[PDB]
Design an enzyme around this catalytic site. Structure first.
Site, short mmCIF file in Angstrom:
data_model
loop_
_atom_site.label_atom_id
_atom_site.label_comp_id
_atom_site.label_asym_id
_atom_site.label_seq_id
_atom_site.Cartn_x
_atom_site.Cartn_y
_atom_site.Cartn_z
N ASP A 1 0.88 -1.19 0.00
CA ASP A 1 0.00 0.00 0.00
C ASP A 1 0.91 1.23 0.00
OD1 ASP A 1 -2.52 1.61 0.57
OD2 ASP A 1 -1.37 1.93 2.47
N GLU B 1 1.30 -1.14 -5.28
CA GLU B 1 0.02 -0.45 -5.52
C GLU B 1 0.29 1.05 -5.68
OE1 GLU B 1 -1.70 1.94 -3.28
OE2 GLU B 1 -3.87 1.51 -3.67
#
Length: 471
Positions: free
Chosen positions: A193, A234
């Site tokens: 993330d 990501e």
């Protein structure tokens, strides 16, 4: 279970029944044909941002269940877990130890102190202006140590989320051990993330900083490769940043497909979507819906400004039970809060066509749990919570799920997904063609087998064809 070229479900640990035991029942009882993989959104104890401010990776938050429940799901489905490489909870033992013991904390080097980072007479106004900011202020919060001294720590997102310092041996040990622990709970993929934020460097915007970001990604990849686990960096960014990550051999997200498919279906045009399907990286995880809103910045340059404006207005004008206010500050929001099915006006035909395009698009299709059940906008939950994002985060009961399985659109979507999971052709090579301005042909070829989608974007009709030639 090793990653396979099969649909991956995206779910919360508590959005399909009550908890991970319910999730496991729903997977085994209804979804064995239709998903080969599961992305469980962060299920660690968290102090905010529904999972994205984690306190401790070594436990499952007690209401969801335990690591043993996660391990049982891992035996039947390839699994993706999240690691937040950029930040950890202020409520973590690590940060609380830092505030208490300061210089005597074994965790002091995990956080970036303002006094330590900025040389004398810095930052200048230019230094702060150069930083890619996600809020109105410089990305720092004040801290008071137990001993009464004061400083600032780097904080990119919310005041719950304190940035890690990936330059230090202490942060490297924390990340290494956590990646090793997650590897041992059965992960086939680790999603990184906000990885683009992890590098802070003087005279840079502190966003996707080269070359350090490649060192950081390769270091993580090195740890996971020995377990045959995939690292998934990501980023929501211009498609050229996806291309740069893919060039260094990593899989990427396709966050462009959602707006390209909405635009194609609203306009009845095949040109922009065909361009992307030809030019997009071959190693990707494709999406229509995620847990987040529909991203518009991701499709920049893949649609013209006018095509983007037409698509955003089509969503509000044709969308089922969607209001401009739901993506405004009134509901705590460039991302649009809308289920993909409600974005196409709860139109079963257009929705199945969107999913058929997704199944035929280069990459592994990811199917968000709300889209799996052709979920419409949850106005009830949205009004209850005042979180715009909640329009697209319905909590399903097991009884609710049994009823969703009886909708022809859901049964048709399951048939599509089973076909994409089972048909050898998708493990081959892809050919994209357009005829005139409205038609799209996608052919997968693997040896003696060929799978074909012929889609008319103007009348929303389509044909799926599979052949096995034995000569």
């Amino acid at each position: 279970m090793k990653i396979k070229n099969e649909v991956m479900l995206i779910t919360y640990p508590d959005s399909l029944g009550s908890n991970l035991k319910d999730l496991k029942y729903v997977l085994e009882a209804h979804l064995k044909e239709v998903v080969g993989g599961v992305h469980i959104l962060p299920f660690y104890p968290s102090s905010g941002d529904r999972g994205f401010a984690p306190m401790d990776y070594t436990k499952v938050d007690e209401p969801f269940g335990t690591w043993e429940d996660i391990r049982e799901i891992s035996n039947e489905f390839y699994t993706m877990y999240e690691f937040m490489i950029n930040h950890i909870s202020k409520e973590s033992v690590y940060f609380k130890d830092f505030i208490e013991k300061k210089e005597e904390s074994p965790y002091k080097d995990l956080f970036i102190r303002y006094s330590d980072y900025w040389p004398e007479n810095r930052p200048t106004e230019r230094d702060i202006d150069l930083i890619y900011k996600r809020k109105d202020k410089a990305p720092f919060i004040d801290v008071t140590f137990k001993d009464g001294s004061t400083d600032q720590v780097w904080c990119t997102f919310s005041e719950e989320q304190i940035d890690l310092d990936v330059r230090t041996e202490a942060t490297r040990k924390f990340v290494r051990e956590t990646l090793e622990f997650l590897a041992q709970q059965g992960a086939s993929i680790i999603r990184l993330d906000a990885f683009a934020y992890a590098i802070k460097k003087l005279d840079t915007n502190c966003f996707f900083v080269e070359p350090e970001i490649w060192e950081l990604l390769d270091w993580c990849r090195d740890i996971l490769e020995k377990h045959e686990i995939v690292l998934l960096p990501e980023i929501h960014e211009h498609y050229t940043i996806q291309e740069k990550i893919a060039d260094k051999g990593y899989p990427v997200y396709d966050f462009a497909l959602p707006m390209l498919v909405l635009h194609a279906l609203y306009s009845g045009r095949s040109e922009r979507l065909a361009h992307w399907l030809k030019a997009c990286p071959r190693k990707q995880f494709t999406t229509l819906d995620t847990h987040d809103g529909i991203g518009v910045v991701d499709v920049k340059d893949l649609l013209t400004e006018e095509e983007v404006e037409f698509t955003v207005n089509s969503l509000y004008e044709k969308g089922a039970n969607v209001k401009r206010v739901y993506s405004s500050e009134e509901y705590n929001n460039y991302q649009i809060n809308c289920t993909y099915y409600s974005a196409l006006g709860n139109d079963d035909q257009a929705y199945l066509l969107a999913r058929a395009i997704q199944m035929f698009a280069p990459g592994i299709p990811q199917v968000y749990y709300v889209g799996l059940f052709a979920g419409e906008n949850d106005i009830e939950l949205l009004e209850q919570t005042k979180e715009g994002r909640d329009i697209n985060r319905h909590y399903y009961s097991l009884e609710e799920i049994e009823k969703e399985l009886e909708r022809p659109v859901v049964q048709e979507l399951f048939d599509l997904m089973k076909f994409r999971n089972q048909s050898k052709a998708f493990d081959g090579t892809v050919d994209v063609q357009t005829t005139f301005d409205h038609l799209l042909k996608i052919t997968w070829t693997n040896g003696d087998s060929k799978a074909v989608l012929e889609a008319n974007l103007a009348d929303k009709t389509f044909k799926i064809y599979l052949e096995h030639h034995h000569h």
